[PDB]
Amino acid sequence: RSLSERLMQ
Amino acid sequence: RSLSERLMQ
Amino acid sequence: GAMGSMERASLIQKAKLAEQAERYEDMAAFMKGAVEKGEELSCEERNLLSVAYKNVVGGQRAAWRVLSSIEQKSNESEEGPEVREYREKVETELQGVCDTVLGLLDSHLIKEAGDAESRVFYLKMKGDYYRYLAEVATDKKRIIDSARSAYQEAMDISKKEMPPTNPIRLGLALNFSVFHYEIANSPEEAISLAKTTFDEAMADLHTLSEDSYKDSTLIMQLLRDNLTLWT
Amino acid sequence: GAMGSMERASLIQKAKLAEQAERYEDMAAFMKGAVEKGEELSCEERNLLSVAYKNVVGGQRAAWRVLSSIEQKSNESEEGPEVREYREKVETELQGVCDTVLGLLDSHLIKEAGDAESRVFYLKMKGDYYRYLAEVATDKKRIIDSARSAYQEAMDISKKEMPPTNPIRLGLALNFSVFHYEIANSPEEAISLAKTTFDEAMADLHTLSEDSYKDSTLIMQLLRDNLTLWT
Ligand SMILES: N=C(N)c1cc(-c2ccccc2)c(-c2cn(CCN)cn2)s1
Ligand SMILES: N=C(N)c1cc(-c2ccccc2)c(-c2cn(CCN)cn2)s1
Ligand SMILES: [Cl-]
Ligand SMILES: [Cl-]
Ligand SMILES: [Mg+2]
Ligand SMILES: [Mg+2]
């Protein structure tokens, strides 16, 4: 499954 | 912190 | 709203505490209460709002996918209504969260957002939550077009008003490319958008400080990872 | 109860689905509904009940510890009431979950449990949820004694009715040793109990099948890990 935008770590 | 009983995996 | 009696600043403080405690439903309730105070949100506050609801809906989406897979297996295979009922329960909850977020954007975050960094952020969010609705829709066509329309408006503003390395612009393009691949049955459009986004960002990295470079390249890596999966 | 209209078997099925979907609040609600049907629980059902509530209360305990640490740091240091208020909110929720579990045990799971494997399981659970109440209590003395009393009754039955390798007996002794170390300020009693439990189980392993050996030794490893931390 494609990767979407992640929250800033 | 002490380890307590775990759920069966 | 149950947060109507709490000060805006206290809601923001408690949202940050909830994040630290990994209490994302609480975090989302606090941030909804803050939005409902009627004032615009700062950059940090917009990201708190997104973190909270992304975590809530992310757990719902993961659960829905597990249950949908079990349901699909059961329909090949011995039967009862329970798997469908429980998948429907989780689905309805997920739709409710998406409707809540969309409602906050429509009342009245988007209409008051004039700067590119707020307006693009909220329009991207609108696309994202319509996309999550589309994932479970089966009706589906209009939900898909609502996601597309929000992403397209965000893209048009982002290309005019932000540099190609801006992290909101990058995250928008990333998520629109996921929309094309996973929702709109347009893998070629997904690949083209990811490639053009990556290449235009690469060419603008030289303008950035070390900290901005780290932020932008982290998102670019997701574009690259998807391109590797898609090709 | 909101689960009053659902069949017992459907509640159990949905609890298993909720577990697969990592939806532990739903799992706990389904299992509470199953308990409230008034029938005794099978071994598998008792473990579903425990898994569900252990996950719910475990998240609450982790959040409470984060917030309590922030609160303690703030009271050395610039101030507002928000950290205390939010710690109190999480605490009250946690107490509510513990009270719910204790209420199920008292109405009427324990009184109908006659076999050692059910009665020890439920009395251990009673000790555990009083222990979780004790973790946040500041009143504390009577809660501590309620945990102690439940664990002691469970221990007395377990020593008479179960072999030393029985996993319920082992988990009970493990958790009673944690009670002694972390709640009752009795580290020596904790160490003694863990040592005696481990050694008596070791000596009974020869009687077990391969699968029972794996189950018992897994729990014994936790006794050993605690002894390493405590000495
Ligand atoms: N408490 C959190 N999770 C977050 C806090 C912030 C933050 C925002 C502004 C100032 C200080 C912190 C976040 C942020 C920033 N951006 C944009 C650059 N990509 C994305 N997220 S996220
Ligand atoms: N769906 C789950 N999580 C669980 C299912 C079972 C289970 C119980 C009986 C039969 C088949 C499965 C569990 C179990 C068993 N015991 C006791 C041995 N230590 C501990 N837990 S746990
Ligand atoms: Cl259901
Ligand atoms: Cl609060
Ligand atoms: Mg005010
Ligand atoms: Mg019936």
Side-chain angles (χ1 to χ4, degrees), chain A residues 1-8, chain B residues 1-8, chain C residues 1-71 74-76 78 80-139 141-159 161-213 215-228 230-231, chain D residues 1-71 74-76 78 80-139 141-159 161-213 215-228 230-231:
Chain A
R1 207 175 289 262
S2 299
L3 307 175
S4 62
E5 178 205 49
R6 295 180 178 165
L7 306 171
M8 196 165 185
Chain B
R1 207 175 289 262
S2 299
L3 307 175
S4 62
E5 178 205 49
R6 295 180 178 165
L7 306 171
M8 196 165 185
Chain C
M3 300 301 173
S5 64
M6 205 186 305
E7 289 277 15
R8 191 186 188 281
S10 297
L11 289 162
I12 296 303
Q13 184 183 356
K14 290 179 184 180
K16 293 170 185 176
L17 292 172
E19 184 179 28
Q20 288 177 266
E22 288 174 41
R23 292 271 294 193
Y24 295 105
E25 294 188 32
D26 287 350
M27 193 187 180
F30 293 139
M31 290 309 303
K32 177 174 188 288
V35 169
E36 290 170 348
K37 298 300 177 184
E39 304 280 357
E40 299 185 29
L41 304 194
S42 71
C43 184
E44 181 175 5
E45 295 163 353
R46 294 190 293 272
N47 283 281
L48 292 166
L49 178 69
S50 177
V51 168
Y53 279 109
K54 181 69 215 74
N55 273 276
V56 172
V57 82
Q60 296 172 319
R61 291 163 75 207
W64 185 94
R65 291 168 184 170
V66 167
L67 299 170
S68 181
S69 170
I70 294 169
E71 187 182 10
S74 78
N75 296 339
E76 305 191 274
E78 283 287 328
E82 289 84 358
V83 174
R84 172 188 56 75
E85 288 172 347
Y86 186 49
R87 187 271 297 157
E88 282 170 353
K89 179 191 191 174
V90 172
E91 184 171 300
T92 297
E93 193 186 280
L94 182 163
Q95 294 168 323
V97 169
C98 292
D99 290 345
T100 290
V101 171
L102 291 166
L104 297 173
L105 297 168
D106 199 52
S107 300
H108 297 277
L109 288 169
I110 289 168
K111 68 172 56 64
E112 296 290 358
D115 294 354
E117 282 232 334
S118 61
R119 190 167 187 83
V120 174
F121 184 97
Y122 292 135
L123 288 167
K124 176 188 163 290
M125 204 154 181
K126 182 175 185 167
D128 287 340
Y129 284 83
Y130 275 116
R131 169 163 61 88
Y132 307 148
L133 289 174
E135 289 177 337
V136 306
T138 51
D139 169 64
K141 280 182 174 177
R142 258 178 289 267
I143 293 166
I144 292 174
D145 202 68
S146 288
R148 183 207 52 74
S149 176
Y151 283 136
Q152 187 65 59
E153 186 176 351
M155 288 287 301
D156 293 339
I157 297 164
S158 79
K159 288 176 150 191
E161 304 292 346
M162 293 167 156
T165 48
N166 177 285
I168 305 164
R169 181 166 165 181
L170 288 173
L172 164 62
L174 174 62
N175 285 7
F176 198 18
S177 75
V178 170
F179 168 85
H180 290 306
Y181 193 90
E182 300 284 349
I183 308 296
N185 195 36
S186 300
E188 292 177 328
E189 186 72 17
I191 290 163
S192 185
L193 179 54
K195 284 192 192 304
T196 292
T197 301
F198 185 94
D199 289 344
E200 293 171 19
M202 176 65 36
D204 189 56
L205 292 174
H206 70 96
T207 68
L208 302 182
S209 71
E210 178 167 34
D211 285 0
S212 296
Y213 185 90
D215 294 338
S216 297
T217 57
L218 200 68
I219 305 162
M220 290 169 66
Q221 184 59 49
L222 300 176
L223 294 162
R224 178 51 55 193
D225 290 341
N226 282 336
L227 282 166
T228 299
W230 295 345
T231 70
Chain D
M3 300 301 173
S5 64
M6 205 186 305
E7 289 277 15
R8 191 186 188 281
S10 297
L11 289 162
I12 296 303
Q13 184 183 356
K14 290 179 184 180
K16 293 170 185 176
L17 292 172
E19 184 179 28
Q20 288 177 266
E22 288 174 41
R23 292 271 294 193
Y24 295 105
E25 294 188 32
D26 287 350
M27 193 187 180
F30 293 139
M31 290 309 303
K32 177 174 188 288
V35 169
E36 290 170 348
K37 298 300 177 184
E39 304 280 357
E40 299 185 29
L41 304 194
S42 71
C43 184
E44 181 175 5
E45 295 163 353
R46 294 190 293 272
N47 283 281
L48 292 166
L49 178 69
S50 177
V51 168
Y53 279 109
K54 181 69 215 74
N55 273 276
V56 172
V57 82
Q60 296 172 319
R61 291 163 75 207
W64 185 94
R65 291 168 184 170
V66 167
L67 299 170
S68 181
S69 170
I70 294 169
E71 187 182 10
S74 78
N75 296 339
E76 305 191 274
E78 283 287 328
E82 289 84 358
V83 174
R84 172 188 56 75
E85 288 172 347
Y86 186 49
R87 187 271 297 157
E88 282 170 353
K89 179 191 191 174
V90 172
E91 184 171 300
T92 297
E93 193 186 280
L94 182 163
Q95 294 168 323
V97 169
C98 292
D99 290 345
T100 290
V101 171
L102 291 166
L104 297 173
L105 297 168
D106 199 52
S107 300
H108 297 277
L109 288 169
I110 289 168
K111 68 172 56 64
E112 296 290 358
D115 294 354
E117 282 232 334
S118 61
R119 190 167 187 84
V120 174
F121 184 97
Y122 292 135
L123 288 167
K124 176 188 163 290
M125 204 154 181
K126 182 175 185 167
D128 287 340
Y129 284 83
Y130 275 116
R131 169 163 61 88
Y132 307 148
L133 289 174
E135 289 177 337
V136 306
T138 51
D139 169 64
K141 280 182 174 177
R142 258 178 289 267
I143 293 166
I144 292 174
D145 202 68
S146 288
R148 183 207 52 74
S149 176
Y151 283 136
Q152 187 65 59
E153 186 176 351
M155 288 287 301
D156 293 339
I157 297 164
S158 79
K159 288 176 150 191
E161 304 292 346
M162 293 167 156
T165 48
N166 177 285
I168 305 164
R169 181 166 165 181
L170 288 173
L172 164 62
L174 174 62
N175 285 7
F176 198 18
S177 75
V178 170
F179 168 85
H180 290 306
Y181 193 90
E182 300 284 349
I183 308 296
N185 195 36
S186 300
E188 292 177 328
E189 186 72 17
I191 290 163
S192 185
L193 179 54
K195 284 192 192 304
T196 292
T197 301
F198 185 94
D199 289 344
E200 293 171 19
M202 176 65 36
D204 189 56
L205 292 174
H206 70 96
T207 68
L208 302 182
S209 71
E210 178 167 34
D211 285 0
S212 296
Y213 185 90
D215 294 338
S216 297
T217 57
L218 200 68
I219 305 162
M220 290 169 66
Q221 184 59 49
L222 300 176
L223 294 162
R224 178 51 55 193
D225 290 341
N226 282 336
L227 282 166
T228 299
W230 295 345
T231 70

